[PDB]
Design a protein around this ligand. Structure first.
Ligand SMILES: Nc1nc2c(ncn2[C@@H]2O[C@H](COP(=O)(O)OP(=O)(O)OP(=O)(O)O)[C@@H](O)[C@H]2O)c(=O)[nH]1
Ligand SMILES: Cc1cc2nc3c(=O)[nH]c(=O)nc-3n(C[C@H](O)[C@H](O)[C@H](O)COP(=O)(O)O)c2cc1C
Ligand SMILES: [Ca+2]
Ligand SMILES: [Mg+2]
Length: 320
């Protein structure tokens, strides 16, 4: 079918207006190059970070008004790179609607230059960016939406960071919402996967479901070394997901696989009169909640990590 997003060699972002402050959920390589930001630095944030001292605030208000009214707009305004380099941005914004006809995303295309353009030059630029926006809209239809839920501190953010950047973040900072992207080869075909990271904390219960509409697959995560997090799969995560999304495939993911055989961890659990969750126990839970797959992984060693996302995609593309 249609091209994937990574083949569109233009500056653009896609945002999710259902989440607080309409954050970026996809950014093109060209946009990264233009703006000097890393992908993780800007995914999960509102695009206003591009603005600065010389930006015309009236023009910014036009953009806000268009977003609020869910209509397209085309403007020119001064923006800045991460290092403070000024550029002119011939900017086009348009809503992307789902099958029903409701707004699902906003698409924004930037044509960068060194001055405000007019007459013929303006007309040419506007035509180019509008065409680009239409190509993005077609390609974005196949963006797979995967939402990751589970208790606080089970490793949701670490596994996303490990998978998408091969690093390990370490120092625990609780998440509100954040987003990650991956282009994954599945049976020799490129697939764009969007990953919505969410807050495990119960006090975020009223916000979390803002991420749920139009989800293609859920990963419900629990730590293999926290029996409480495992029990919460049955008591909390499964029922919450099913309440909003009765028919969406779930993959059950056991995290921190590397700690299941860790001597200190086993000893600490023993002090609490507990033991790690075993593979057979995790599998039985998966069957209980009707998960299409049960998988184990470590963000630290990356063991099993690739398979998680490969199977998330297959759960959507290859539904038996
Ligand atoms: N040994 C080991 N530690 C891990 C692994 N994954 C996460 N951790 C540790 O667990 C802590 C919590 O990880 P996070 O990914 O931030 O937890 P979270 O699930 O995103 O928590 P919330 O954002 O609050 O919902 C991290 O500080 C890591 O040090 C892992 O695979 N192996
Ligand atoms: C799809 C999308 C792309 C955007 N791209 C830019 C951009 O390239 N440059 C910019 O200055 N603002 C951009 N914005 C506008 C800001 O995100 C924000 O909507 C604007 O600053 C007005 O809202 P605010 O007053 O709350 O900041 C974009 C918005 C969306 C929805
Ligand atoms: Ca981010
Ligand atoms: Mg997190």
């Amino acid at each position: 079918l249609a091209t994937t997003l990574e083949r569109i060699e233009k500056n653009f972002v896609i945002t999710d207006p259902r989440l607080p402050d309409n954050p970026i959920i996809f950014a093109s390589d060209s946009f990264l190059q233009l703006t000097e930001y890393s992908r993780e630095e800007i995914l999960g944030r509102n695009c206003r970070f591009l603005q600065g001292p010389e930006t015309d605030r009236a023009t910014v208000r036009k953009i806000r008004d268009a977003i609020d009214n869910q209509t397209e707009v085309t403007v020119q305004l001064i923006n800045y790179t991460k290092s403070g380099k000024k550029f002119w941005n011939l900017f086009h914004l348009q809503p992307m609607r789902d099958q029903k006809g409701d707004v699902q995303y906003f698409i924004g295309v930037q044509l960068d230059g060194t001055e405000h353009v007019r007459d013929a030059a303006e007309r040419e630029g506007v035509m180019l960016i509008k065409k680009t926006a239409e190509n993005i809209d077609e390609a974005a239809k196949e963006l797979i939406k995967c939402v990751v839920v589970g208790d606080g501190a089970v490793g949701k953010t670490c596994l996303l960071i490990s998978y998408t950047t091969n690093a390990f973040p370490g120092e625990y900072i609780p998440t509100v919402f954040d987003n990650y992207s991956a282009n994954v080869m599945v049976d020799g075909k490129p697939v764009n996967l969007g990953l919505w990271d969410t807050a495990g904390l119960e006090d975020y219960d009223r916000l979390r479901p803002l991420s749920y509409p139009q989800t293609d697959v859920f990963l419900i995560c629990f730590s293999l070394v926290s029996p409480a997090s495992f029990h919460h799969v049955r008591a909390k995560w499964y029922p919450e997901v099913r309440h909003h999304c009765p028919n969406t495939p779930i993959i059950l993911v056991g995290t921190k696989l590397d700690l299941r055989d860790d001597k200190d961890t086993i000893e600490k659990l023993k002090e609490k009169k507990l033991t790690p969750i075993t593979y057979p126990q995790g599998l039985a839970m998966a069957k209980e909640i009707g998960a299409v797959k049960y998988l184990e992984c470590s963000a630290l060693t990356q063991r099993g990590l690739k398979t998680v996302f490969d199977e998330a995609i297959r759960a959507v593309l290859c539904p038996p």
